[PDB]
């Protein structure tokens, strides 16, 4: 909306970002299961915090 139909020097507009695209990879047919194996629970390893 800030880029009006007017002419601009190419030096001025060169670095102005004229589009942002956001994309994420998806599955529709495996939406809940995803890549789950065996149990719904996933195992996380951690450093004992208490020591």
């Amino acid at each position: 909306t800030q880029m009006k139909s007017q002419w601009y020097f190419q030096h001025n507009i060169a670095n102005i970002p004229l589009l942002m695209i956001r994309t994420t990879a998806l599955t529709l047919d495996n939406y809940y299961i995803g890549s789950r194996q065996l149990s719904t629970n996933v195992t996380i390893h951690t450093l004992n915090t208490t020591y």
């Binding site: 020097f9 190419q10 030096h11 507009i13 060169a14």
Partner: protein, 51 residues
């Protein structure tokens, strides 16, 4: 100069004062078309351009 002087005795030959050069010119325009397959082309950076 002697055979030029004999030619100057003939009709239509001009009178030009000594030390003057007479001149004539035409402006021409020859019309052409150039034909071919589409040529290549190149471009210039926007930041380093007519400021």
């Amino acid at each position: 100069e002697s055979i030029n002087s004999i030619c100057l005795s003939g009709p239509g030959t001009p009178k030009i004062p000594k030390g003057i050069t007479a001149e004539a010119k035409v402006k021409y325009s020859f019309n052409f078309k150039w034909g071919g397959d589409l040529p290549p082309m190149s471009t210039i950076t926007n930041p380093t351009d007519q400021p």
